[PDB]
PDB file of C-alpha atoms and ligand atoms in Angstrom:
ATOM      1  CA  UNK X  12       0.046   0.058  -0.233  1.00  0.00           C
ATOM      2  CA  UNK X  13       1.172   3.476  -1.188  1.00  0.00           C
ATOM      3  CA  UNK X  14       1.819   6.367   1.165  1.00  0.00           C
ATOM      4  CA  UNK X  15      -0.465   9.584   0.814  1.00  0.00           C
ATOM      5  CA  UNK X  16       2.606  11.335  -0.812  1.00  0.00           C
ATOM      6  CA  UNK X  17       3.281   8.440  -3.199  1.00  0.00           C
ATOM      7  CA  UNK X  18      -0.362   8.231  -4.138  1.00  0.00           C
ATOM      8  CA  UNK X  19      -0.323  11.933  -4.835  1.00  0.00           C
ATOM      9  CA  UNK X  20       2.999  11.506  -6.954  1.00  0.00           C
ATOM     10  CA  UNK X  21       1.331   8.415  -8.824  1.00  0.00           C
ATOM     11  CA  UNK X  22      -1.821  10.774  -9.580  1.00  0.00           C
ATOM     12  CA  UNK X  23       0.273  13.457 -10.971  1.00  0.00           C
ATOM     13  CA  UNK X  24       2.148  11.109 -13.241  1.00  0.00           C
ATOM     14  CA  UNK X  25      -0.727   9.069 -14.491  1.00  0.00           C
ATOM     15  CA  UNK X  26      -2.720  12.113 -15.365  1.00  0.00           C
ATOM     16  CA  UNK X  27       0.283  13.416 -17.571  1.00  0.00           C
ATOM     17  CA  UNK X  28       0.694  10.033 -18.934  1.00  0.00           C
ATOM     18  CA  UNK X  29      -2.689   9.748 -20.398  1.00  0.00           C
ATOM     19  CA  UNK X  30      -3.267  12.940 -21.993  1.00  0.00           C
ATOM     20  CA  UNK X  31      -1.035  11.517 -24.825  1.00  0.00           C
ATOM     21  CA  UNK X  32      -2.116   9.621 -27.323  1.00  0.00           C
ATOM     22  CA  UNK X  33      -1.236   8.773 -31.277  1.00  0.00           C
ATOM     23  CA  UNK X  34      -3.402  10.612 -33.680  1.00  0.00           C
ATOM     24  CA  UNK X  35      -5.925   8.885 -35.829  1.00  0.00           C
ATOM     25  CA  UNK X  36      -4.179  10.409 -39.190  1.00  0.00           C
ATOM     26  CA  UNK X  37      -0.989   8.469 -38.478  1.00  0.00           C
ATOM     27  CA  UNK X  38      -2.918   5.285 -37.356  1.00  0.00           C
ATOM     28  CA  UNK X  39      -4.999   5.252 -40.763  1.00  0.00           C
ATOM     29  CA  UNK X  40      -1.883   5.583 -42.817  1.00  0.00           C
ATOM     30  CA  UNK X  41      -0.816   2.059 -41.528  1.00  0.00           C
ATOM     31  CA  UNK X  42      -3.603   0.924 -43.597  1.00  0.00           C
ATOM     32  CA  UNK X  43      -4.007   3.533 -46.445  1.00  0.00           C
ATOM     33  CA  UNK X  44      -0.609   4.176 -47.813  1.00  0.00           C
ATOM     34  CA  UNK X  45       1.035   2.480 -50.394  1.00  0.00           C
ATOM     35  CA  UNK X  46       3.431  -0.472 -49.349  1.00  0.00           C
ATOM     36  CA  UNK X  47       6.901   0.713 -50.509  1.00  0.00           C
ATOM     37  CA  UNK X  48      10.348   1.173 -48.694  1.00  0.00           C
ATOM     38  CA  UNK X  49      10.202   5.204 -49.133  1.00  0.00           C
ATOM     39  CA  UNK X  50       6.288   5.377 -47.796  1.00  0.00           C
ATOM     40  CA  UNK X  51       6.835   2.694 -44.890  1.00  0.00           C
ATOM     41  CA  UNK X  52       9.979   4.708 -44.002  1.00  0.00           C
ATOM     42  CA  UNK X  53       7.809   8.118 -43.829  1.00  0.00           C
ATOM     43  CA  UNK X  54       5.054   6.521 -41.854  1.00  0.00           C
ATOM     44  CA  UNK X  55       7.906   5.518 -39.301  1.00  0.00           C
ATOM     45  CA  UNK X  56       9.177   8.964 -39.217  1.00  0.00           C
ATOM     46  CA  UNK X  57       5.771  10.924 -38.639  1.00  0.00           C
ATOM     47  CA  UNK X  58       5.338   8.055 -35.628  1.00  0.00           C
ATOM     48  CA  UNK X  59       8.540   9.116 -33.972  1.00  0.00           C
ATOM     49  CA  UNK X  60       8.127  12.782 -34.490  1.00  0.00           C
ATOM     50  CA  UNK X  61       4.699  12.336 -32.731  1.00  0.00           C
ATOM     51  CA  UNK X  62       6.345  10.386 -30.041  1.00  0.00           C
ATOM     52  CA  UNK X  63       8.764  12.929 -29.369  1.00  0.00           C
ATOM     53  CA  UNK X  64       5.911  15.719 -29.145  1.00  0.00           C
ATOM     54  CA  UNK X  65       4.229  13.274 -26.597  1.00  0.00           C
ATOM     55  CA  UNK X  66       7.470  12.872 -24.837  1.00  0.00           C
ATOM     56  CA  UNK X  67       7.905  16.637 -24.469  1.00  0.00           C
ATOM     57  CA  UNK X  68       4.524  17.462 -22.852  1.00  0.00           C
ATOM     58  CA  UNK X  69       4.921  14.603 -20.424  1.00  0.00           C
ATOM     59  CA  UNK X  70       8.587  15.550 -19.510  1.00  0.00           C
ATOM     60  CA  UNK X  71       7.603  19.123 -18.874  1.00  0.00           C
ATOM     61  CA  UNK X  72       4.770  18.121 -16.290  1.00  0.00           C
ATOM     62  CA  UNK X  73       7.086  15.598 -14.259  1.00  0.00           C
ATOM     63  CA  UNK X  74       6.761  17.032 -10.713  1.00  0.00           C
ATOM     64  CA  UNK X  75      10.033  19.243  -9.995  1.00  0.00           C
ATOM     65  CA  UNK X  76      11.165  19.138 -13.816  1.00  0.00           C
ATOM     66  CA  UNK X  77      10.338  22.849 -14.192  1.00  0.00           C
ATOM     67  CA  UNK X  78      12.775  23.489 -11.122  1.00  0.00           C
ATOM     68  CA  UNK X  79      15.825  22.351 -12.984  1.00  0.00           C
ATOM     69  CA  UNK X  80      17.943  24.527 -14.989  1.00  0.00           C
ATOM     70  CA  UNK X  81      16.898  25.225 -18.588  1.00  0.00           C
ATOM     71  CA  UNK X  82      20.051  23.879 -19.956  1.00  0.00           C
ATOM     72  CA  UNK X  83      19.616  20.718 -17.681  1.00  0.00           C
ATOM     73  CA  UNK X  84      16.085  20.279 -18.974  1.00  0.00           C
ATOM     74  CA  UNK X  85      17.431  20.218 -22.440  1.00  0.00           C
ATOM     75  CA  UNK X  86      19.877  17.614 -21.479  1.00  0.00           C
ATOM     76  CA  UNK X  87      17.277  15.223 -19.942  1.00  0.00           C
ATOM     77  CA  UNK X  88      15.226  15.583 -22.949  1.00  0.00           C
ATOM     78  CA  UNK X  89      17.936  14.873 -25.391  1.00  0.00           C
ATOM     79  CA  UNK X  90      19.424  12.102 -23.270  1.00  0.00           C
ATOM     80  CA  UNK X  91      16.356  10.202 -22.836  1.00  0.00           C
ATOM     81  CA  UNK X  92      14.620  10.398 -26.191  1.00  0.00           C
ATOM     82  CA  UNK X  93      15.678   7.237 -27.804  1.00  0.00           C
ATOM     83  CA  UNK X  94      14.949   4.945 -24.716  1.00  0.00           C
ATOM     84  CA  UNK X  95      11.489   6.892 -23.952  1.00  0.00           C
ATOM     85  CA  UNK X  96      10.602   6.225 -27.839  1.00  0.00           C
ATOM     86  CA  UNK X  97      11.575   2.534 -27.591  1.00  0.00           C
ATOM     87  CA  UNK X  98       9.613   2.200 -24.432  1.00  0.00           C
ATOM     88  CA  UNK X  99       6.502   3.811 -25.676  1.00  0.00           C
ATOM     89  CA  UNK X 100       6.544   1.981 -28.976  1.00  0.00           C
ATOM     90  CA  UNK X 101       6.570  -1.082 -26.933  1.00  0.00           C
ATOM     91  CA  UNK X 102       3.484  -0.106 -24.895  1.00  0.00           C
ATOM     92  CA  UNK X 103       1.590   0.815 -28.538  1.00  0.00           C
ATOM     93  CA  UNK X 104       2.711  -2.400 -29.886  1.00  0.00           C
ATOM     94  CA  UNK X 105       1.785  -4.736 -27.157  1.00  0.00           C
ATOM     95  CA  UNK X 106      -1.038  -3.064 -25.804  1.00  0.00           C
ATOM     96  CA  UNK X 107      -2.788  -0.154 -27.643  1.00  0.00           C
ATOM     97  CA  UNK X 108      -2.936  -1.535 -31.143  1.00  0.00           C
ATOM     98  CA  UNK X 109      -5.471  -3.845 -32.534  1.00  0.00           C
ATOM     99  CA  UNK X 110      -3.736  -7.154 -33.699  1.00  0.00           C
ATOM    100  CA  UNK X 111      -4.267  -6.120 -37.445  1.00  0.00           C
ATOM    101  CA  UNK X 112      -2.826  -2.656 -36.934  1.00  0.00           C
ATOM    102  CA  UNK X 113       0.222  -4.267 -35.165  1.00  0.00           C
ATOM    103  CA  UNK X 114       0.596  -7.039 -37.669  1.00  0.00           C
ATOM    104  CA  UNK X 115       0.644  -4.511 -40.694  1.00  0.00           C
ATOM    105  CA  UNK X 116       2.783  -1.928 -38.931  1.00  0.00           C
ATOM    106  CA  UNK X 117       5.213  -4.698 -38.328  1.00  0.00           C
ATOM    107  CA  UNK X 118       5.400  -5.425 -42.007  1.00  0.00           C
ATOM    108  CA  UNK X 119       6.024  -1.893 -42.877  1.00  0.00           C
ATOM    109  CA  UNK X 120       8.743  -1.638 -40.280  1.00  0.00           C
ATOM    110  CA  UNK X 121      10.459  -4.589 -41.822  1.00  0.00           C
ATOM    111  CA  UNK X 122      10.263  -3.496 -45.273  1.00  0.00           C
ATOM    112  CA  UNK X 123      11.260   0.338 -44.688  1.00  0.00           C
ATOM    113  CA  UNK X 124      15.067  -0.172 -45.795  1.00  0.00           C
ATOM    114  CA  UNK X 125      16.186  -0.574 -42.223  1.00  0.00           C
ATOM    115  CA  UNK X 126      18.562  -3.753 -42.086  1.00  0.00           C
ATOM    116  CA  UNK X 127      17.568  -6.663 -39.812  1.00  0.00           C
ATOM    117  CA  UNK X 128      20.422  -6.192 -37.635  1.00  0.00           C
ATOM    118  CA  UNK X 129      18.344  -3.339 -36.174  1.00  0.00           C
ATOM    119  CA  UNK X 130      14.924  -4.726 -36.793  1.00  0.00           C
ATOM    120  CA  UNK X 131      15.412  -7.994 -34.779  1.00  0.00           C
ATOM    121  CA  UNK X 132      16.528  -6.682 -31.513  1.00  0.00           C
ATOM    122  CA  UNK X 133      13.581  -4.303 -31.497  1.00  0.00           C
ATOM    123  CA  UNK X 134      11.048  -6.932 -31.932  1.00  0.00           C
ATOM    124  CA  UNK X 135      12.787  -9.118 -29.481  1.00  0.00           C
ATOM    125  CA  UNK X 136      12.822  -6.398 -26.990  1.00  0.00           C
ATOM    126  CA  UNK X 137       8.819  -5.849 -27.685  1.00  0.00           C
ATOM    127  CA  UNK X 138       8.283  -9.416 -26.868  1.00  0.00           C
ATOM    128  CA  UNK X 139      10.500  -9.689 -23.948  1.00  0.00           C
ATOM    129  CA  UNK X 140       8.711  -6.426 -22.797  1.00  0.00           C
ATOM    130  CA  UNK X 141       5.343  -8.138 -23.427  1.00  0.00           C
ATOM    131  CA  UNK X 142       5.691 -11.239 -21.631  1.00  0.00           C
ATOM    132  CA  UNK X 143       6.291  -9.172 -18.242  1.00  0.00           C
ATOM    133  CA  UNK X 144       2.453  -8.258 -18.979  1.00  0.00           C
ATOM    134  CA  UNK X 145       2.879  -4.582 -17.453  1.00  0.00           C
ATOM    135  CA  UNK X 146      -0.088  -2.323 -16.413  1.00  0.00           C
ATOM    136  CA  UNK X 147      -0.281   1.452 -17.492  1.00  0.00           C
ATOM    137  CA  UNK X 148       1.071   2.647 -14.351  1.00  0.00           C
ATOM    138  CA  UNK X 149       4.434   0.568 -14.950  1.00  0.00           C
ATOM    139  CA  UNK X 150       4.909   2.007 -18.102  1.00  0.00           C
ATOM    140  CA  UNK X 151       4.296   5.318 -17.009  1.00  0.00           C
ATOM    141  CA  UNK X 152       6.836   5.199 -14.143  1.00  0.00           C
ATOM    142  CA  UNK X 153       9.240   3.287 -16.011  1.00  0.00           C
ATOM    143  CA  UNK X 154       9.218   6.280 -18.885  1.00  0.00           C
ATOM    144  CA  UNK X 155       9.461   8.858 -15.752  1.00  0.00           C
ATOM    145  CA  UNK X 156      12.589   6.917 -14.494  1.00  0.00           C
ATOM    146  CA  UNK X 157      14.090   6.847 -18.039  1.00  0.00           C
ATOM    147  CA  UNK X 158      13.510  10.537 -18.396  1.00  0.00           C
ATOM    148  CA  UNK X 159      14.732  11.627 -14.973  1.00  0.00           C
ATOM    149  CA  UNK X 160      17.915   9.638 -15.379  1.00  0.00           C
ATOM    150  CA  UNK X 161      21.085  11.529 -13.382  1.00  0.00           C
ATOM    151  CA  UNK X 162      23.498   9.565 -15.729  1.00  0.00           C
ATOM    152  CA  UNK X 163      22.903  11.674 -19.216  1.00  0.00           C
ATOM    153  CA  UNK X 164      25.664  13.697 -20.562  1.00  0.00           C
ATOM    154  CA  UNK X 165      25.695  17.344 -19.869  1.00  0.00           C
ATOM    155  CA  UNK X 166      23.833  17.411 -16.634  1.00  0.00           C
ATOM    156  CA  UNK X 167      25.283  20.337 -14.247  1.00  0.00           C
ATOM    157  CA  UNK X 168      23.425  19.265 -11.327  1.00  0.00           C
ATOM    158  CA  UNK X 169      22.785  15.535 -11.251  1.00  0.00           C
ATOM    159  CA  UNK X 170      21.896  15.605  -7.436  1.00  0.00           C
ATOM    160  CA  UNK X 171      18.520  17.632  -8.464  1.00  0.00           C
ATOM    161  CA  UNK X 172      17.795  14.999 -10.802  1.00  0.00           C
ATOM    162  CA  UNK X 173      18.461  12.174  -8.775  1.00  0.00           C
ATOM    163  CA  UNK X 174      16.547  13.497  -5.901  1.00  0.00           C
ATOM    164  CA  UNK X 175      13.365  13.690  -8.367  1.00  0.00           C
ATOM    165  CA  UNK X 176      14.096  10.107  -9.829  1.00  0.00           C
ATOM    166  CA  UNK X 177      14.364   8.600  -6.194  1.00  0.00           C
ATOM    167  CA  UNK X 178      10.596   8.663  -5.326  1.00  0.00           C
ATOM    168  CA  UNK X 179       9.443   7.073  -8.454  1.00  0.00           C
ATOM    169  CA  UNK X 180      11.706   4.334  -8.154  1.00  0.00           C
ATOM    170  CA  UNK X 181       9.948   3.733  -4.401  1.00  0.00           C
ATOM    171  CA  UNK X 182       6.551   4.003  -6.224  1.00  0.00           C
ATOM    172  CA  UNK X 183       7.631   1.386  -8.864  1.00  0.00           C
ATOM    173  CA  UNK X 184       8.765  -1.473  -6.221  1.00  0.00           C
ATOM    174  CA  UNK X 185       5.369  -1.088  -4.307  1.00  0.00           C
ATOM    175  CA  UNK X 186       3.558  -1.044  -7.767  1.00  0.00           C
ATOM    176  CA  UNK X 187       5.035  -4.401  -8.549  1.00  0.00           C
ATOM    177  CA  UNK X 188       4.107  -5.784  -5.061  1.00  0.00           C
ATOM    178  CA  UNK X 189       0.432  -4.629  -5.879  1.00  0.00           C
ATOM    179  CA  UNK X 190      -0.068  -5.713  -9.303  1.00  0.00           C
ATOM    180  CA  UNK X 191       2.532  -8.598  -9.706  1.00  0.00           C
ATOM    181  CA  UNK X 192       2.228 -10.108  -6.033  1.00  0.00           C
ATOM    182  CA  UNK X 193       2.628 -13.620  -7.277  1.00  0.00           C
ATOM    183  CA  UNK X 194       6.209 -12.532  -8.835  1.00  0.00           C
ATOM    184  CA  UNK X 195       8.476 -11.044  -5.999  1.00  0.00           C
ATOM    185  CA  UNK X 196      11.513 -10.725  -8.648  1.00  0.00           C
ATOM    186  CA  UNK X 197       8.920  -8.650 -11.137  1.00  0.00           C
ATOM    187  CA  UNK X 198      10.582  -5.368  -9.992  1.00  0.00           C
ATOM    188  CA  UNK X 199      14.076  -6.646 -10.795  1.00  0.00           C
ATOM    189  CA  UNK X 200      12.787  -7.959 -14.123  1.00  0.00           C
ATOM    190  CA  UNK X 201      11.524  -4.477 -15.169  1.00  0.00           C
ATOM    191  CA  UNK X 202      15.031  -2.858 -14.240  1.00  0.00           C
ATOM    192  CA  UNK X 203      16.522  -5.543 -16.086  1.00  0.00           C
ATOM    193  CA  UNK X 204      14.558  -4.384 -19.437  1.00  0.00           C
ATOM    194  CA  UNK X 205      15.999  -1.271 -18.409  1.00  0.00           C
ATOM    195  CA  UNK X 206      19.288  -2.526 -19.241  1.00  0.00           C
ATOM    196  CA  UNK X 207      18.036  -3.738 -22.307  1.00  0.00           C
ATOM    197  CA  UNK X 208      16.596  -0.486 -23.334  1.00  0.00           C
ATOM    198  CA  UNK X 209      19.632   1.603 -22.920  1.00  0.00           C
ATOM    199  CA  UNK X 210      21.314  -0.683 -25.671  1.00  0.00           C
ATOM    200  CA  UNK X 211      19.247   1.088 -28.085  1.00  0.00           C
ATOM    201  CA  UNK X 212      21.320   4.083 -27.658  1.00  0.00           C
ATOM    202  CA  UNK X 213      24.037   2.437 -29.644  1.00  0.00           C
ATOM    203  CA  UNK X 214      21.561   0.475 -32.167  1.00  0.00           C
ATOM    204  CA  UNK X 215      19.952   3.820 -33.067  1.00  0.00           C
ATOM    205  CA  UNK X 216      23.305   5.800 -33.315  1.00  0.00           C
ATOM    206  CA  UNK X 217      24.552   2.987 -35.787  1.00  0.00           C
ATOM    207  CA  UNK X 218      21.206   3.191 -37.709  1.00  0.00           C
ATOM    208  CA  UNK X 219      21.232   6.739 -38.114  1.00  0.00           C
ATOM    209  CA  UNK X 220      24.858   6.109 -39.646  1.00  0.00           C
ATOM    210  CA  UNK X 221      23.226   3.689 -42.070  1.00  0.00           C
ATOM    211  CA  UNK X 222      23.577   4.687 -45.946  1.00  0.00           C
ATOM    212  CA  UNK X 223      19.936   3.729 -46.542  1.00  0.00           C
ATOM    213  CA  UNK X 224      18.944   6.326 -43.677  1.00  0.00           C
ATOM    214  CA  UNK X 225      20.886   9.043 -44.784  1.00  0.00           C
ATOM    215  CA  UNK X 226      19.160   9.014 -48.137  1.00  0.00           C
ATOM    216  CA  UNK X 227      16.477  10.748 -46.200  1.00  0.00           C
ATOM    217  CA  UNK X 228      15.182  13.976 -44.803  1.00  0.00           C
ATOM    218  CA  UNK X 229      13.827  13.907 -41.096  1.00  0.00           C
ATOM    219  CA  UNK X 230      11.518  16.222 -39.823  1.00  0.00           C
ATOM    220  CA  UNK X 231      12.514  19.547 -37.849  1.00  0.00           C
ATOM    221  CA  UNK X 232      11.920  17.982 -34.375  1.00  0.00           C
ATOM    222  CA  UNK X 233      13.903  14.632 -35.233  1.00  0.00           C
ATOM    223  CA  UNK X 234      16.540  16.619 -36.544  1.00  0.00           C
ATOM    224  CA  UNK X 235      17.151  18.690 -33.384  1.00  0.00           C
ATOM    225  CA  UNK X 236      16.380  15.901 -30.667  1.00  0.00           C
ATOM    226  CA  UNK X 237      18.511  13.468 -32.465  1.00  0.00           C
ATOM    227  CA  UNK X 238      21.599  15.799 -33.330  1.00  0.00           C
ATOM    228  CA  UNK X 239      21.305  14.476 -37.053  1.00  0.00           C
ATOM    229  CA  UNK X 240      23.055  17.147 -38.533  1.00  0.00           C
ATOM    230  CA  UNK X 241      23.413  19.447 -35.335  1.00  0.00           C
ATOM    231  CA  UNK X 242      25.999  19.578 -32.809  1.00  0.00           C
ATOM    232  CA  UNK X 243      25.962  17.587 -29.513  1.00  0.00           C
ATOM    233  CA  UNK X 244      25.467  19.469 -26.191  1.00  0.00           C
ATOM    234  CA  UNK X 245      22.566  21.070 -24.367  1.00  0.00           C
ATOM    235  CA  UNK X 246      23.516  24.746 -24.897  1.00  0.00           C
ATOM    236  CA  UNK X 247      20.462  26.850 -24.955  1.00  0.00           C
ATOM    237  CA  UNK X 248      21.304  28.726 -28.356  1.00  0.00           C
ATOM    238  CA  UNK X 249      21.796  25.315 -30.203  1.00  0.00           C
ATOM    239  CA  UNK X 250      18.218  24.182 -29.472  1.00  0.00           C
ATOM    240  CA  UNK X 251      15.373  26.826 -30.244  1.00  0.00           C
ATOM    241  CA  UNK X 252      13.028  24.515 -31.320  1.00  0.00           C
ATOM    242  CA  UNK X 253      13.261  22.260 -28.231  1.00  0.00           C
ATOM    243  CA  UNK X 254      13.375  25.603 -25.981  1.00  0.00           C
ATOM    244  CA  UNK X 255      10.181  26.747 -27.856  1.00  0.00           C
ATOM    245  CA  UNK X 256       8.340  23.260 -27.373  1.00  0.00           C
ATOM    246  CA  UNK X 257       9.468  23.267 -23.459  1.00  0.00           C
ATOM    247  CA  UNK X 258       8.138  26.509 -22.908  1.00  0.00           C
ATOM    248  CA  UNK X 259       4.875  25.557 -24.239  1.00  0.00           C
TER     249      UNK X 259
HETATM  250  N1  XAW B 301       7.150   4.645 -33.265  1.00  0.00           N
HETATM  251  C1  XAW B 301       6.951   3.086 -33.224  1.00  0.00           C
HETATM  252  C2  XAW B 301       5.389   2.968 -32.668  1.00  0.00           C
HETATM  253  C3  XAW B 301       5.111   1.706 -32.650  1.00  0.00           C
HETATM  254  C4  XAW B 301       5.931   0.802 -33.365  1.00  0.00           C
HETATM  255 CL1  XAW B 301       5.347  -1.096 -33.140  1.00  0.00          CL
HETATM  256  C5  XAW B 301       7.016   0.743 -33.624  1.00  0.00           C
HETATM  257  C6  XAW B 301       7.403   2.412 -33.783  1.00  0.00           C
HETATM  258  N2  XAW B 301       8.879   2.637 -34.275  1.00  0.00           N
HETATM  259  C7  XAW B 301       9.828   2.112 -33.489  1.00  0.00           C
HETATM  260  C8  XAW B 301      10.928   3.105 -33.349  1.00  0.00           C
HETATM  261  N3  XAW B 301      11.095   3.828 -34.406  1.00  0.00           N
HETATM  262  C9  XAW B 301      12.706   3.916 -34.948  1.00  0.00           C
HETATM  263  O1  XAW B 301      13.336   3.590 -34.501  1.00  0.00           O
HETATM  264  C10 XAW B 301      13.011   4.988 -36.304  1.00  0.00           C
HETATM  265  C11 XAW B 301      14.623   4.703 -36.064  1.00  0.00           C
HETATM  266  C12 XAW B 301      15.056   5.682 -37.438  1.00  0.00           C
HETATM  267  C13 XAW B 301      14.468   7.227 -37.498  1.00  0.00           C
HETATM  268  C14 XAW B 301      12.895   7.006 -37.646  1.00  0.00           C
HETATM  269  C15 XAW B 301      12.263   6.323 -38.834  1.00  0.00           C
HETATM  270  C16 XAW B 301      12.915   4.832 -38.825  1.00  0.00           C
HETATM  271  C17 XAW B 301      14.685   4.844 -38.684  1.00  0.00           C
HETATM  272  C18 XAW B 301      12.690   3.947 -37.328  1.00  0.00           C
HETATM  273  C19 XAW B 301      12.640   6.269 -36.225  1.00  0.00           C
HETATM  274  C20 XAW B 301       9.899   4.440 -35.203  1.00  0.00           C
HETATM  275  C21 XAW B 301       8.948   3.349 -35.481  1.00  0.00           C
END
């Protein structure tokens, strides 16, 4: 059972996590669009861009996130985007889409000019995440914990970040007791898939280097948050788009 303050915190998180969905225009493209590598790749690009917009809105409302330095805010956004995208896509693929949407979406991902050395880890992770059979609250807390990670590059005040991250980890452990009482190692399997999740930072960096992927013009938002051509760092002047979205 949760403390009053853990319950307040959990309700803040859930209210922000739920204000976030995939737009019907994007969902309909999975059926509507022609089936070619170029059009499949552009659907994935539109999903990634929407993922990032949603991630930014969620991030802004994490309790205490607004009390960090603007440059550290940028550094948490940049550092967590890839992991938060793969965690959210796993939720979508396992829990939100009808089975027909999920089957077709997978076919389009497998036929978008991305090499199979990046695809199969993605889907192996999706299956490994799905067998844990997580509730919405576990996805929401795990995403908050990924975002408020005191280990990202360019954070000036890591103690401020760890102090926000520590109460979310307590809540998560209790939630695993409450919703998975049969399995007392559930919490450890969750954090174990955090380890698998971080491997996608390197997979993704490799993917952006691929010659297929560079035959392509990313969206404004993806170029900024993934440093596609940009410079790396968290300087305020170097991320006007992110600052704009952060300031609402
Ligand atoms: N966004 C989403 C929602 C549901 C499901 Cl089943 C899968 C996904 N993707 C998995 C994560 N992704 C990517 O890594 C991408 C990585 C690079 C740059 C973008 C275009 C593609 C090449 C695929 C984003 C987007 C598609």
